[PDB]
Design a protein around this ligand. Structure first.
Ligand SMILES: [Zn+2]
Length: 90
């Protein structure tokens, strides 16, 4: 974890919000791929909130691998809300 990584996570969270509002569906997909990688790197190796971000991210991968879109989507809602809290990015 680190401050430049934290700001890049905040940048990508902000662009996801902007791209979503503007209807840029392909860019949203790319942004979510970037956020995924940044989360793996930032949370490598914490507070209860950080532990739950890590757990929920892991279960998100398991749901995605099975194509379980219904569970992916509500995992995403939970994960992204916790990320917005941890990184103070509304
Ligand atoms: Zn991921």
């Amino acid at each position: 974890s680190g401050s430049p990584l934290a700001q890049q996570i905040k940048n990508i969270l902000s662009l996801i919000s902007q791209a979503d509002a503007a209807g840029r569906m392909d860019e949203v997909r790319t942004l979510q791929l970037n956020l995924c990688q940044l989360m793996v790197e930032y949370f490598q190796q914490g507070s209860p909130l950080a532990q739950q971000i890590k757990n929920i991210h892991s279960f998100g991968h398991q749901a995605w691998a099975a194509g379980r879109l219904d569970e992916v989507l509500t995992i995403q809602e939970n994960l992204y809300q916790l990320m917005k809290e941890y990184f103070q990015q509304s």
